[PDB]
Amino acid sequence: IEYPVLQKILIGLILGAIVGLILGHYGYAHAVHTYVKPFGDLFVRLLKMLVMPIVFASLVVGAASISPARLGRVGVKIVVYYLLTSAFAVTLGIIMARLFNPGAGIHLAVGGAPPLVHILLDIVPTNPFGALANGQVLPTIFFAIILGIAITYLMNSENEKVRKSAETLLDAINGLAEAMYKIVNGVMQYAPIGVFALIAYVMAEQGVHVVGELAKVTAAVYVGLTLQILLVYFVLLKIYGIDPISFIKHAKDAMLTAFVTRSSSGTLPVTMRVAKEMGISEGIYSFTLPLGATINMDGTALYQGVCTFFIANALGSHLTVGQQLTIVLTAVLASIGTAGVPGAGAIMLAMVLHSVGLPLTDPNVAAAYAMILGIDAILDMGATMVNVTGDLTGTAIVAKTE
Template structure:
């Protein structure tokens, strides 16, 4: 076990990816009821279920704590505005790339998928549903629904939890010093939840084997072949944003590409495996802080990004999927409809709610454009395969915006950022937090009450 622990986390995930593909190919001939396929499904489902179980308390506590901590920051309003602005900028660019690829390749007209597979998804989104969904049904955002066998399934609405937590965070700011005892409890609970989540994240390499193995065994290469142009467009778009757009933005802001790529890799790889931006959030915040972003800003930008910043799920994917559906049904899109795709991608990102899948965002886009919702069923067969890449880009973009805004506002520790190009991320434990930077230590000395929030030095 000690030997395994010494292997960098990213390498462990890569090993899980390779093993998952191999086992998936072995399980494919056995069918969905084969013992190996069932085993892979059980392992992958258990990992995702563990992540989902910790999401509601994590979102609530992280958002409340991050908003409350903004009272220690003199330029909090400017940081928040810059963060939202860069969320929109990167979303517009990603959406434009998706539209461009769709127009050039017409993926729907090149598909061999059977029209009989078309069908309206059980999970749908519309602007009315989106607006109604903003109103919390209860304080915890919990909902329940009955099933055909008479049992009751409990769930949660991440968007409602986000609204509740923002309201509570603002209330804490308004109350002032009287809310300090409450905030202390929130911070203590957040530390406990993050510790639990780190334990789950330790299982990511094993979860990788199950998730990817089951996807390969169940969906196989036939479904990918039928939608080959669409899958290729998705991953080409993701690659263009990750390897062209993001590096250009980094260079334009005077930041090294290698430092960011090496620093963000653990979060990117975990997002690829878990297919959950929220489940990856602690890792994303950790790597962002390790790249020199002050904790008081990272603790605000990353939780917000994990729920609203989706360059993969809410930008590239709905743009390409909408064009695919239009091609498939022989519908010509107007310039105004292309503009609407961009608008929906920028304004509707929160509808994805940070969890696995982007069906809600797609149905929201299709309904806005007036395209057949039955087109969703055409793409469901390969959704898990492309969702891995989408989520990996999501979390990468969330960290990117944090780094860029910190650089532009002159709060980024450049020495720590540049050091990320030569230091490997090995820690995976909750205590393995970024070392305190000189800038943070200086701020703590000048601002009473900040010292307890400065990251402490830890082992390499």
């Protein structure tokens, strides 16, 4: 139950990727799935477990921070933060989708409803207890904020049974909040097993596919986001003090979980614990790391920039070069929010085709789309890991302001 720290993770990752990529090439991809996968799950399981308490609890406490600003500000900022990162991510994806040209081997050309208001009203839960119980991040967010603001106001009550109990609750809640961070490390001790087993399977069952013209989308994603980290985030970390390499130092574990869990929200326990140990206050990170996981577009903007190209160019089309954006922007904007779920990228890509006019019925549209689906998991890992890097970057910059 001992041994080296987060190199033990990197020992799992590289050793897994190799043993999986090998094992699926020799076809046992299924056998890997029935023997290895469940240790990879048990990791995501234990992380998921925490996500609800660790968010709800932390954010009642995170409304002990100055309410009118802080939770009125920052929200204004971190929104405008993602605007100016997603903007850069879009043009970094398009200019990666021209650079690499994934549409040469195919080459096979075939011709050719959200209300918002009834999703805005969904933010406000009608039963917070249910909210928590039955998953749900973004209504639990809204409650916790409204609770901790209410508690704040109870402490300034001239009565002192009230001022009394007010404390009791908030403390007891912080008991939980803290308790969970304690577990998040208990889990992390199983993270090398979890990582090894996860990208063992994910490399067996979709690695072999990363070959040929399919691989030419994986290039423009993986180096396209590698360039989002270096050229857009570090440029923003450099320009706001906080030291770029000391950042990766601290954010090591949240990125290696985001990459492997492939789930933005499913890593928030680790994501948040890195912001504690980094030294941001709960009053910021408890509201910008969850509202990040669901509002962050850096990933989808960069994956449906190069994948949008791949399809438009594989059915042998111009793609209105430089009018890529018209489609890529409209994709992001169709689900500005709720990009946290794994596999979500594939869904919007399909949904865009409904808008493009090329419906998934056209058996060659469906053919090209199915190739992306044999590679989506690899393209999802990188997109989430660059999302949760972008989440902390957004946090640590706004934090070191307000």
